[PDB]
Copies of this chain bind each other. A is one copy, B any other.
Amino acid sequence: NGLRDPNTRWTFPIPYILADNLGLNAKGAILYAFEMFRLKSCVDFKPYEGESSYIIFQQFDGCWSEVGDQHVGQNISIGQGCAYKAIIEHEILHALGFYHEQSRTDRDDYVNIWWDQILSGYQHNFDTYDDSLITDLNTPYDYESLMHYQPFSFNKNASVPTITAKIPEFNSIIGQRLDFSAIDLERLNRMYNCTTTHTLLDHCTFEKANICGMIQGTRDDTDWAHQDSAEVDHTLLGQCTGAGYFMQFSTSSGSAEEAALLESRILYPKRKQQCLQFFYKMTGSPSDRLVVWVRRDDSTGNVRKLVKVQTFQGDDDHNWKIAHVVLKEEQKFRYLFQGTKGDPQNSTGGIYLDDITLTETPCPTGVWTVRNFSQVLENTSKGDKLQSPRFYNSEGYGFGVTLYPNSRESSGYLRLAFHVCSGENDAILEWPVENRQVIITILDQEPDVRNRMSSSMVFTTSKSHTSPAINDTVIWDRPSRVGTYHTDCNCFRSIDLGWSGFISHQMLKRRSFLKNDDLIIFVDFEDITHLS
């Protein structure tokens, strides 16, 4: 589906303008979509500085873009309801030189277009272009392509689909709005020669003979073991013996205060802040400690300087846990895991590691894990709720999320809603909390970020958000006077806002959103007033 002409290609970075007719939320969502290009490709973006060709983003009616670099400059439109990661990703892919997936020259072998049922003025979104205009890039028809339309796209009658696959099962798949597909990234790579990315710096499932270039120090008491899953890893959940590998550190024998270091390869950063994401178990004593360290360049070039960054200790949950550690490395470094034995006479177990990822991105502000989700989803009635632990953002605001496993508002869908929690800082924070962008994300447990298609939704807190339940006062005002008391956290929690129909039960049982029968949700609550 790529425009054949080699003259129609951008030279990176793409220069851009965000027009002031975009709201704060749309500005934020475009800047968020840019980070997905930088994480999964070598496409990059810069502010406009007098270049010949550029993108300007505007709030015109609907979502649309020109195709390819048009060398005078061009518009992307992000209309009302178009401010979403996936939809902005769809439009920037047009500007990069892509047509829709149904616009391939071979598409008639794969789909039906029901021509009578398209709304007038939209028929060109269902046209096909001849092989002089477009190229296959040696790739098949990707029904999961972000550039494909959903069945009910610009239809006359809501009961009748405009587009269907010639095999009916794919009607459940066509027109996903999660993320870039694997073949969409492969096509974008094949068009622009990217193979590296700007912000994926390391990843390790431990399934290599060199263990991803990790090493172990002599200046410790013991070693971590490369463990055969023959007690199962996180990458494959024990699908076969010797297929999934992990690092294990036993704590059931020896002295207390014995330890082992696992050190990464040396890493060269391109940004000032990194996020280390990893999965772990702690089945041993409550006094065992998994400690994360950095060993960094001393400014001579010798990577020999230790810094302790975080400590983890064992509760009564012995299942796999996700961990996020903020690093702040600006010179070459190695990240380190120290496992420490404590009370071996009261440990029947140890420390486990798998599925490490390192990105040059922020770590998520709040993480909620809901266990046994496929059982919770049957045990919970329509409109019954789960509520998160309270989270604090960088500004000190308390927040949380409400999850309704069965939405009364849309059957066969999940409903996620954000709320503000009362917290220890409230007495000095500004109220109502507005111009704060909420990004809720349901993670794809893929340890490689080029494979992930995480669901995400975005909104910005506004003075327009009001409810009759609080006498038409702002939902985001101080929780002690616009919220209700909960014994689970001793909080007041606001009225909750978000999406009925966030993700379907038929989507959630796919793409590893439930990899160990558990759901992981990321929440960012951050001020975007500086985009005004």
Contact = CB atoms under 8 A, between A and B. Distances in A.
Contacts of A259: 427-428
Interface of A: 217, 219-221, 257-259, 261, 289, 293, 298-300, 302, 304-308, 338, 340, 394-396, 424-430, 527, 529-530, 532
A396 B298 contact: no
Contacts of A299: 530
A428 to B, nearest CB: 5
29 contacts: A219-B428, A219-B429, A220-B427, A220-B428, A257-B424, A257-B426, A257-B427, A258-B427, A259-B427, A261-B428, A289-B424, A298-B529, A298-B530, A299-B530, A300-B530, A300-B532, A302-B530, A305-B395, A305-B527, A306-B394, A306-B395, A306-B396, A306-B428, A307-B394, A307-B395, A308-B396, A308-B425, A338-B428, A340-B427
Given A298-B530, A305-B395, A307-B395, 14 more contacts: A217-B428, A219-B430, A220-B427, A220-B428, A221-B427, A257-B424, A259-B427, A298-B527, A304-B529, A305-B527, A306-B394, A306-B396, A306-B429, A307-B394
A338 B396 CA distance: 13
Contacts of A221: 427
Contacts of A527: 298, 305
Which 9 interchain pairs have the tightest Cβ spacing?
Answer: A259-B427, A298-B530, A306-B395, A300-B530, A299-B530, A220-B428, A308-B396, A338-B428, A261-B428
Nearest to A258: B427
A257 B479 CA distance: 14
A396 B338 CA distance: 13
A235 to B, nearest CB: 27
A532 B429 CA distance: 49
Contacts of A289: 424
Contacts of A340: 424, 427
Nearest to A422: B257
A425 to B, nearest CB: 7
- Residue from the set A221, A302, A308, A429 with the largest chain B CB neighbour count within 10 Å: A308
A304 B302 CA distance: 40
A396 B298 CA distance: 16
A258 B426 CA distance: 10
Contacts of A425: 308
A259 B423 CA distance: 13
Contacts of A307: 394-395
A532 B396 CA distance: 43
Contacts of A261: 428
A391 to B, nearest CB: 14
A338 B89 CA distance: 43
A106 B492 CA distance: 76
A481 to B, nearest CB: 13
**Looking at A429, A527, A530, which has the most chain B CB atoms within 10 Å of its CB?**
A530
Contacts of A532: 300
A411 to B, nearest CB: 42
A188 B62 CA distance: 69
A437 to B, nearest CB: 14
A428 B336 CA distance: 11
Contacts of A338: 427-428
A429 to B, nearest CB: 7
Nearest to A255: B427
A303 B220 CA distance: 47
A184 to B, nearest CB: 33
A428 B257 CA distance: 10
A340 B530 CA distance: 29
Contacts of A300: 530, 532
Nearest to A257: B427
A84 to B, nearest CB: 25
A4 to B, nearest CB: 42
A300 B532 CA distance: 9
A29 to B, nearest CB: 19
A271 to B, nearest CB: 15
A348 B2 CA distance: 75
Contacts of A430: 219
A315 to B, nearest CB: 20
Nearest to A259: B427
Contacts of A258: 427
A334 to B, nearest CB: 13
A236 B219 CA distance: 52
